[PDB]
Amino acid sequence: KYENHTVTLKILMTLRYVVSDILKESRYQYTKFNQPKSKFENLPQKLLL
Amino acid sequence: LEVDGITETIGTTQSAMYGGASAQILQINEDIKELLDGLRAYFGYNMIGL
């Protein structure tokens, strides 16, 4: 029925991101309290999407 | 403590005038006082002649 016609739509789509740059990449801490020995842990990174 | 945009702050029960566990000790002392004084009724006072 719509062989030669222009169809227009409004749509919902799921959100998506990709990483363009890494900002404040690595943050650190020598956690020692209430541990058998010293441990190294990586704190949250910040991402620019 | 604040490092590179991430910060943490804590205020503890520890204080110059009271200890950290002082709250529990106060409650325990309260319970014991009622418990002991009431229990002393089960045994009663001590008497001796002269």
Cβ contact B5–A44 (<8 Å): no
Neighbouring residues of A31: CB distance < 8 A, sequence distance ≥ 6: A38, A39, A40, A41
PDB resolution in Å: 4.3
- Specify the residue for token string 């490092």: B3
Instruction: Measure Cα distances from A9 to A5, A15, A33, A46 in Å.
Output: 13, 18, 59, 36
Q: Are the CB atoms for A41 and A18 separated by under 8 Å? A: no
Experimental method: cryo-EM
Beta bridge partners of A46: A23
B interface test, pick of A23, A27, A30, A41 with most B CB neighbours within 10 Å: A27
CA distance linking residue B31 with residue B45, whole number of Å: 21
**Greatest Cα-to-Cα distance within chain A, rounded to the nearest angstrom:** 76
Neighbouring residues of B2: CB distance < 8 A, sequence distance ≥ 6: B8
CA distance linking residue B2 with residue B6, whole number of Å: 6
Which residues in chain B have Cβ-Cβ distances shorter than 8 Å to A27?
3-4, 6
